[PDB]
Amino acid sequence: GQIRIIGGQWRGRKLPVPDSTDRVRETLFNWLAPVIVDAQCLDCFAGSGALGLEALSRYAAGATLIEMDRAVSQQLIKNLATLKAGNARVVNSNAMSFLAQKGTPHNIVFVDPPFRRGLLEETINLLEDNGWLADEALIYVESEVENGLPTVPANWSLHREKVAGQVAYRLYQREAQ
Ligand SMILES: [Cl-]
């Protein structure tokens, strides 16, 4: 497995992601371009780290990367060490346990769960209820079109949306209320 960082300080740098897309990341980070510098980012299901790593490359101030798979969390840590990225941490946890505590506010949150039903709406409510979001946070949500629009709290509004293939890529903006 290889991950390519397509932008920022490590643009073009290639990283191994063990035995277990560009246009997506391109679209998302174009949406995030004017807020990404010095942002605090949380990746709820970091997986390969594609999202968190691209965020750090583009001069995010910091990224907390949450990943349930121990082997995957370990490789992520190794890739951060390669890149000399000290302004990040990896927590080996499922998102439901992790977010069910008093949180810390983030400017940008990535919500791309490995499966939708049982995780997506639950994660969204925990983010909102436990203080994980800064006053005007952006939350990226990836979901199959077939699922419809996810239930979001009333103070979240749909900010950007792209549909490609079977998948809806969305960015919500949250108002502190
Ligand atoms: Cl989870």
From Swiss-Prot:
It is an enzyme of class 2 (transferase). Pfam families: Cons_hypoth95. Keywords: Methyltransferase, rRNA processing, S-adenosyl-L-methionine, Transferase. It comes from the Bacteria. One of its GO terms (molecular function) is 16S rRNA (guanine(966)-N(2))-methyltransferase activity. The keyword Metal-binding does not apply. Signal peptide: none annotated. Its EC number is 2.1.1.171. It catalyses: guanosine(966) in 16S rRNA + S-adenosyl-L-methionine = N(2)-methylguanosine(966) in 16S rRNA + S-adenosyl-L-homocysteine + H(+). InterPro entries: DNA_methylase_N6_adenine_CS, RNA_MeTrfase_RsmD, SAM-dependent_MTases_sf. GO terms for biological process: rRNA base methylation. Belongs to the methyltransferase superfamily. RsmD family. Specifically methylates the guanine in position 966 of 16S rRNA in the assembled 30S particle. PANTHER family: METHYLTRANSFERASE. This is Ribosomal RNA small subunit methyltransferase D. The lineage of its organism: Bacteria, Pseudomonadati, Pseudomonadota, Gammaproteobacteria, Enterobacterales. The gene is rsmD.
